[PDB]
Amino acid sequence: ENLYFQMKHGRVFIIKSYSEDDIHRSIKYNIWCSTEHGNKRLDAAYRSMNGKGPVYLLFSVNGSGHFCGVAEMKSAVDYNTCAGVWSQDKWKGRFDVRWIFVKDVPNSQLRHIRLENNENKPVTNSRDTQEVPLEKAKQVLKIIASYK
Ligand X SMILES: CNC(=N)c1ncccn1
The annotated binding site for RNA is made up of 16-18, 22, 32-33, 62, 86, 91
CB of 35: closest distance to ligand X in angstroms? 5
Q: Which is nearer to ligand X, 92 or 142 (CB)?
A: 92
N-to-C CA span, the chain: 17
Distance (Å, whole) CA 117 – CA 23: 27
Q: Mask 80-99, x = binds ligand X (CB under 6 A)?
A: ------xx---x--------
Q: Which stretch binds ligand X (CB under 6 A): 14-22, 50-58, 111-119, 133-141?
A: 14-22
Q: Binding of ligand X at residue 13 (CB under 6 A)?
A: no
Those residues with Cβ within 8 angstroms of residue 67's Cβ, 6 or more apart along the chain or in another chain: 58, 59, 60, 104, 105, 107, 110, 124, 144
Site for ligand X in 29-48 (CB under 6 A): 33-35, 38
Query: Strand, coil or helix: what is 47?
Result: helix
Cβ at position 94, least distance to ligand X in Å: 9
Compute the distance between CA of residue 101 and CA of residue 72 in angstroms, rounded to an integer. 10
- Kindly state whether residue 18 participates in binding ligand X, applying the rule CB under 6 A: yes
Give 13's strand partners: 57, 131
The contact set with ligand X (CB under 6 A) reads 16-19, 22, 33-35, 38, 86-87, 91, 128
